[PDB]
């Protein structure tokens, strides 16, 4: 039974000799130890780091028959210092760049004993992954990031992987929504890594993230939009007025290229043209057509040319607008389509 | 999911080849060129990476085969430069992931090519 | 004169034979943990990462049979470096994501042992914690920030948490403790939860902390400009109309004042994809600033090219101001009465 | 004689037995723990932070009378670990965000005991302190700001503080000057505080910052008044060339934005007008009626001397009346 | 007895009488500590800073007599906990400025034992490790940045550090995924350096970083270019238009220098001027130039046939005259940054 | 040598050697006053920060001294230590009186060093990454030069117990890795050294210090802050070719440069601590804004007398303002550019 010195010396028993260099059945077969994990949340997501932050609960099981006990029908739950005493998994994650487990009031770290000797070893961590991204389809993109775990020292012939549960192992990513994107689905995969020194396990988590458009129509389609066709106000403007359609025109050059910068202040320095980035350019192109449009009104009027001015302006307000069209059709269906 | 094929192995000299890959090759930045023969192992050749251009090569081609790609056409070209008989075996190309280990080793390699053979 | 020692004697005498890995009364009984909050300052929120960070000190209490004693004096203040000998209940913040326990010239820790082997246990905390915000009323929206917390490794049939007096008087604020510049804290609410999960069912503790956006910031800094570059672009229907030039100036300039404006307003809040009600209101002011400069483009093709055009900046005079003012007064309706 | 040999096993002597868990005097009165500190610098005092960075030496003296010792005639120093084997009170700093005992080569604490048991035990720290800021008079405010110094968990009755030398217990507060603000004023408290534990001893280090004007003389004063002065130029430009006497006063609104907004962004979201806030809507007032007399001119000398019998007015108004505003403004913050 | 008691046995046999403070072959010849690295990844190459955080597997590998065991044909592979009770070599990086190893989990460590007493031990490393950039030709720049890999307590004839597999001895350049640079080699060294306390060996692990022009070609010099180009069409404009005349002259000056602002912030306060400088600068002077042609069009317009004459030829000129003149810059600016 | 029972013998002497040994009392406490000979080696010095008014400089502090309880007698005279046994011998505890923040590499061991002479002598080396705080000037903000200080003593033992001394003499003692240096704004005109005697609360202190004179370059400052103010005047004074029929352009054009000063005045501050008063860059600043203020109220007077009074002379200024201005201009910057050059 429970009895309080019963459990006190049955646990002494167990970890008096017991030997922490030395994993389980050392010599024999591998420890096959199950993996499990409860997302708590994806922090942030971010292109110009190109990596991820996530907090979660970590476990994993394994009969360490060194633990087995009779006599006690519990499954003893512990303090968590026992993990200094026992032996536990050398797992960590490939691609992080910076973890570490959750310290408050004392170690987040969990151990609980069972009659057969099994262990559930758990902690609860926070994790930046690093994921670099397939930015050209940038306001239109889906991104795959993943979490890899392998055992650092124990390779093959010592430690084994699988996911305890299969395709039910990990929980809580149907809870996690994001400003920037949105988890269409998530994929668990089980597989053998080798390098020189041997072939080691791995377990691999990943997502694919789905952006979410809603964002960049706010914040650059519309202003860029607006500003594009504020720049055919020039035609809607008599020639007679020299001076005032070149203020037009230059200021919508300003406000194009002030609006570029402000996507350059939130991006990574990177080298490709993304899909913003021309349609940017397209809208430029626009507003500078449009003052050199009447940089040439001018030239012809001073080089019966009132009425070529007048119908070169009439020409423009017609096929501005058509030409604009023609461009966001092909746009728009080029980089849905693809 | 990736999906490549080969092209341009045969008989001879000098010779190359190409391996054109499709799909989500970002998620595969590394490509590699191994190579097989009845009674032997498969056996490693070289690799390239996406954009970075940065190869490396078995010892025991090294200084004759280099390995570039075109990231336009999605295609990476192998050169089979002063052939020796011993070069006699099919070249299968294949993909490895974003965070698969050695290169040396055929296991980390997902996607394969259908191996062209070669002759001398 | 003895009690410099006889309480060594004492002491002694009850940590031998003692064993921290199990907590008190394993077998017999259910451990409940009396707990208790005291938010000596709260503060700051920084919605832009959706975290709010709060100082606490946080006590707890519970019997530890073991420690039942006998001696002259009822109750003992004992030194921070035996909390780690005796057992202490491994509770931890299920929505926290980065702690500090502050260790100042010795660990912020109180430790106190009745005579009836009560303890009492404190620590002074820094908790950085989520907090679920819903951003589409922006400018007038409101919060509960929870804050939960629960045995990491126990279950409910092990460890329970009881707030010490039950009602709501069981977490307090300080009366100046407020570091908060951009909220108000309009109160609180305190329960209690089972959650289930991969481990088992805890049984968490729960509090709500209230908050208010303070409008005063954005009324000086977002409201007033854009109502005044509205007004900036509404003087220039009484500029005499064969100005070109300066009508032309004050339209493109205070389209340029919004789209800086809008595009720094933005510059704020965890980039999320819908629009919010500072969106509806800045979209609104640059409709206005816009239509405006269509109006004088209109203006100024039938001014040049004969017809009854005058009443046309007579009636904008009237509309423009009118227009704004009714919108004003309607959305500050619909956000105030909300 | 050998009294390197001695002292080994007097230390020896005083360290066998000695109960870490029980503070001096346990069970007895309590043990009266006299503090000393000597400023070294204070750093980054931050608005948008809302605290102030101050590195200090920190020193603290008892009586713990299992120390005593009389065969060796020497203030007795010691390594540093033996503060760790030691007693030693458990003061915090209740108002600390942030703080860390410094370590370059060893840990920065001092141990130094004496015949009658007296132990010197001092620190060398950096602590981040909050530091609620009013800033509604900026940048002509002062501010008060402490540091509080309490002990965690023995109460009034169990540990009892002091300043020695009282006023002069703090030193190097008479050297630090910051590039925003001037050491006004410290003062020296010592009270009580009630929680529902029990009742603590306080010590708390006032200070009194009065901020610099230099800064703001250069970025904020200066380049609004010339900006306001230049809106002026207006009234002499001809009002017939419209182009030039808009362009130059909506010149001038934009620029006051654009001063105002990088002024500000340096700056903590604060809901309410600043004394400096103030001064810009007074400015942008200005400004924006210096442009709006250019639009009424232009539209009633269309519906004629009623256009130069208001500018030759509005010459002299607009000094004038800008004039009075600094009057006001400056004897409102500065003098009342 | 049993082959987990009898392997227990062997290592407690092992470390019973094991000094950790003393050497391999204390007073002996020195220990020769084979190398090598595989890199994980470099996060990110810093001007500003001038560091770049340089993410690697670290491998150390040695010789240590006082850990034979016999009978045991396994390698055996001992909880990484025991390190800490073991002599390790005292190796460091010099030019490190601050570094950590990863210790989610258990501290990402690996010690293998070998029947005849080699050791293997290897830690997985994150290190922002500083490297001066020549920003001169900056951004047509490449760097050498380099780790410096060495003993601290002890010297020369004491260890003994060599590349272990020579020129394999680093792997995984091929995975370095930095956006602004691609790494055209990597080389590998081994000297003695010298300071007063004695000789020391170092190992020397250097990459060459060539940038990539994409970024700032489009996002810098191509708005510059247009800007410029703009800037000539007041040459078509006809002179009549005084006011637009200027408008655009200093318009593009004023965008040249909001496109020169946009960098300073981004960038360290070095005290000479750089490749991208000197085409602000050009690009700068030509629109400064074509506002002071168009001063002296109007001076010579209004105030001084030379009334008509000279203006007309002016104006015809400079349509032409500017873009040969930009031309010629940009084509001398690009053939002085890559041809020599 | 002896390779067989030499790991045998140093194990028993070096347990011999520290077993009744405490590292709680100083090498001869009781008796005798400890010197602890100094020295440091500069692997790299800087950057420096003038928003902080600090500098980083990292170094190899090196210390030494005699144990009497460590003397030996074996088959060779100096061993060099495992750096964990630092943590049994008694070592002197050092610190830096400047010191913000620092780092004592702890990166696959402490990056320590100890070794023990047969006659005692310990040597004590380690590297520190070092932020220390300097009382840096800025009342000539880009031509100004600096000393700045490292200073650091003993923390608990008094001058009556502990003293410091340069170990090669204060010619020879510190010294400065020049392949290594990190100064890119700064030029680090040359170093000396020397000792002082603190009283303290805590009684008296010996403080070992080195001050590292720092010159600033100008060379940034020239073309991005003074280069764009100079031609920003002359730009302002390029409106006097405009003949005043303009009167757009004539206005637009000097109001755009003043604009551009105004930007430019408070931009450049962004690398200048907020200081109480104004720096020489700051009387440049001044200058150049009153010149180009100056070109526009040129303007406010010229276009008013040229209608008001059609026979003024006021088609003189477009000559004398014309030809003055840049005169004025040279003059201030031929009073300002001696001035600092020697100031
Ligand atoms: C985000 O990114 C990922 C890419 O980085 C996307 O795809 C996954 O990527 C991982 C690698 O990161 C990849 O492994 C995985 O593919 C599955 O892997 C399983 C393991 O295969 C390994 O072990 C097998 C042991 O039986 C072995 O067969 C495999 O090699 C042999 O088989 C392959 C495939 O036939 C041959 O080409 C190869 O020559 C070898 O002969 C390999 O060593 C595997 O179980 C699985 O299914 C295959 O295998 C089954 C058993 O043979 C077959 O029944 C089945 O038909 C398959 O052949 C996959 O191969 C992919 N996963 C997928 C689904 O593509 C992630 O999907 C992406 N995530 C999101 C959310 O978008
Ligand atoms: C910066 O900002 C801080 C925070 O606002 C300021 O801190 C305050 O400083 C003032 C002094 O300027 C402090 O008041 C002084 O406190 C002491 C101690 O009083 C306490 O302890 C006494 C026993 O030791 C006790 O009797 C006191 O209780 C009585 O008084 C209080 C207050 O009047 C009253 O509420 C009670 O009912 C009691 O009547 C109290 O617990 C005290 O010495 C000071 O003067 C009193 O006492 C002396 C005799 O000792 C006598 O001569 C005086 O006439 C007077 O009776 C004085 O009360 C105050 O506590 C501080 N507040 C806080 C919150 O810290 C700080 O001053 C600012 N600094 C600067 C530079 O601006
Ligand atoms: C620091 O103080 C010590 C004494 O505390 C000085 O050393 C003494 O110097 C005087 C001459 O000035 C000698 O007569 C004494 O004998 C010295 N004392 C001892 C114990 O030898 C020392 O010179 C002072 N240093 C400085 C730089 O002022
Ligand atoms: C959390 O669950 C506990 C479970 O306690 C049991 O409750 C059932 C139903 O009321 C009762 O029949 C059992 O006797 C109870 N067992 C014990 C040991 O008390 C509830 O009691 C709590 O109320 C639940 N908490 C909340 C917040 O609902
Ligand atoms: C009240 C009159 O309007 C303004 O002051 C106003 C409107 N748009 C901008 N401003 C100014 C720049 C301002 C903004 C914020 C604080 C102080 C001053
Ligand atoms: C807090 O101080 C204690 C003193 O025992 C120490 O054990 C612990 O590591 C310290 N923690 C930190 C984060 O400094």
């Given at each position: 039974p429970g009895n309080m010195s019963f459990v006190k010396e049955t646990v002494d028993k167990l970890l008096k000799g017991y030997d922490i260099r030395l994993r389980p059945d050392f010599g024999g077969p591998p420890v096959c130890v199950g993996m499990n994990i409860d997302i708590a949340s994806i922090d942030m997501v971010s292109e110009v780091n190109m990596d991820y932050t996530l907090t979660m609960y970590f476990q994993q099981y394994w009969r360490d028959k060194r633990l087995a006990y009779s006599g006690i029908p519990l499954n003893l739950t512990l303090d968590n210092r026992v993990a200094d005493q026992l032996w536990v998994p050398d797992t960590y994650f490939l691609n992080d760049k910076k973890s570490f487990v959750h310290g408050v009031t004392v170690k987040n770290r969990m151990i609980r004993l069972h009659p057969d000797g099994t262990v559930l070893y758990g902690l609860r961590i926070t994790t930046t992954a690093a994921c670099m991204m397939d930015l050209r389809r940038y306001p239109l993109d889906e991104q795959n990031c993943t979490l890899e775990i392998e055992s650092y020292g124990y390779t093959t012939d010592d430690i084994e992987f699988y996911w305890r549960g299969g395709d039910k192992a990990v929980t809580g990513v149907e809870r996690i929504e994001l400003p920037q994107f949105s988890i269409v689905?998530?994929?668990?995969?089980?597989?053998?890594?080798?390098?020189?020194?041997?072939?080691?396990?791995?377990?691999?988590?990943?997502?694919?993230?789905?952006?979410?458009?809603?964002?960049?129509?706010?914040?650059?389609?519309?202003?860029?939009?607006?500003?594009?066709?504020?720049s055919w106000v020039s035609f809607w403007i008599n020639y007679d007025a020299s001076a005032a359609r070149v203020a037009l025109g230059i200021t919508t050059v300003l406000t194009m290229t002030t609006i570029n910068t402000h996507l350059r202040e939130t991006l990574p320095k990177i080298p490709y043209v993304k899909a913003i980035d021309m349609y940017l350019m397209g809208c430029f192109v626009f507003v500078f057509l449009a003052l050199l449009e009447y940089a040439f009104?001018?030239?012809?009027?001073?080089?019966?040319?009132?009425?070529?001015?007048?119908?070169?302006?009439?020409?423009?307000?017609?096929?501005?607008?058509?030409?604009?069209?023609?461009?966001?059709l092909v746009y728009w269906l080029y980089y849905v389509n693809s | 999911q990736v999906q490549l094929v080969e092209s341009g192995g045969g008989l001879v000299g000098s010779l190359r080849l190409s391996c054109a890959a499709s799909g989500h090759t970002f998620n595969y930045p590394i490509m590699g060129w191994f190579r097989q023969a009845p009674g032997k192992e498969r056996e490693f050749v070289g690799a390239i990476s996406w954009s970075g251009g940065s190869t490396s090569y078995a010892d025991s081609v090294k200084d004759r085969f280099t390995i570039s790609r075109d990231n336009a056409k999605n295609t990476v070209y192998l050169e089979m430069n002063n052939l020796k008989p011993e070069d006699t075996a099919v070249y299968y190309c294949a993909a490895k992931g974003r965070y698969s280990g050695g290169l040396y080793y055929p296991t980390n390699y997902d996607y394969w090519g259908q191996g062209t053979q070669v002759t001398v | 004169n003895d009690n410099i020692t006889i309480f060594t004697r004492i002491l002694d005498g009850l940590l031998?034979?003692?064993?921290?890995?199990?907590?008190?009364?394993?077998?017999?009984?259910?451990?409940?943990?009396?707990?208790?909050?005291?938010?000596?300052?709260?503060?700051?929120?920084?919605?832009?990462?959706?975290?709010?960070?709060?100082?606490?000190?946080?006590?707890?209490?519970?019997?530890?049979?073991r420690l039942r004693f006998k001696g002259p004096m009822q109750r003992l203040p004992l030194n921070n470096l035996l909390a780690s000998k005796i057992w202490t209940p491994d509770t931890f913040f299920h929505n926290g994501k980065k702690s500090i326990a502050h260790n100042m010239t010795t660990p912020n820790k109180l430790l106190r042992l009745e005579d009836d082997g009560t303890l009492l246990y404190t620590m002074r905390l820094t908790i950085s914690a989520e907090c679920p915000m819903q951003l589409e009323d922006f400018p007038m929206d409101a919060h509960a920030c929870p804050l939960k917390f629960g045995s990491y490794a126990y279950p409910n049939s092990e460890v329970v948490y009881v707030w010490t007096n039950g009602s709501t008087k069981s977490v307090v604020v300080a009366e100046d403790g407020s570091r908060l510049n951009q909220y108000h804290l309009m109160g609180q609410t305190v329960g209690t939860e089972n959650i289930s999960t991969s481990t088992g069912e805890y049984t968490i503790m729960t509090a709500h902390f209230h908050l208010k956006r303070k409008i005063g910031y954005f009324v000086i800094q977002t409201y007033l400009p854009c109502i005044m570059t509205v007004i900036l672009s509404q003087v220039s229907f009484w500029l005499n109309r064969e100005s070109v030039p300066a009508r032309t100036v004050f339209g493109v300039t205070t389209v340029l004042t919004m789209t800086t404006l809008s595009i720094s307003a933005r510059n704020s809040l965890p980039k999320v994809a819908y629009a919010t009600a500072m969106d509806w209101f800045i979209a609104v002011c640059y409709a206005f600033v816009f239509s405006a400069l269509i109006e004088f483009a209109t203006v100024n093709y039938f001014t040049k090219s004969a017809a009854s055009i005058s009443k046309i900046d007579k009636m904008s005079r009237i509309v423009f101001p009118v227009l704004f003012g009714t919108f004003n007064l309607v959305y500050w309706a619909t956000y105030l009465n909300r």
């Open positions: 689905e998530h994929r668990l995969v089980s597989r053998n890594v080798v390098f020189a020194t041997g072939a080691y396990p791995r377990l691999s988590l990943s997502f694919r993230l789905k952006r979410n458009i809603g964002y960049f129509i706010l914040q650059t389609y519309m202003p860029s939009i607006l500003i594009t066709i504020l009104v001018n030239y012809i009027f001073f080089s019966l040319y009132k009425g070529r001015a007048a119908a070169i302006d009439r020409w423009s307000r017609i096929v501005f607008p058509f030409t604009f069209s023609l461009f966001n | - | 031998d034979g003692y064993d921290n890995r199990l907590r008190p009364g394993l077998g017999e009984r259910i451990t409940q943990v009396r707990t208790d909050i005291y938010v000596t300052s709260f503060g700051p929120v920084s919605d832009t990462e959706m975290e709010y960070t709060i100082d606490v000190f946080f006590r707890q209490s519970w019997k530890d049979e």
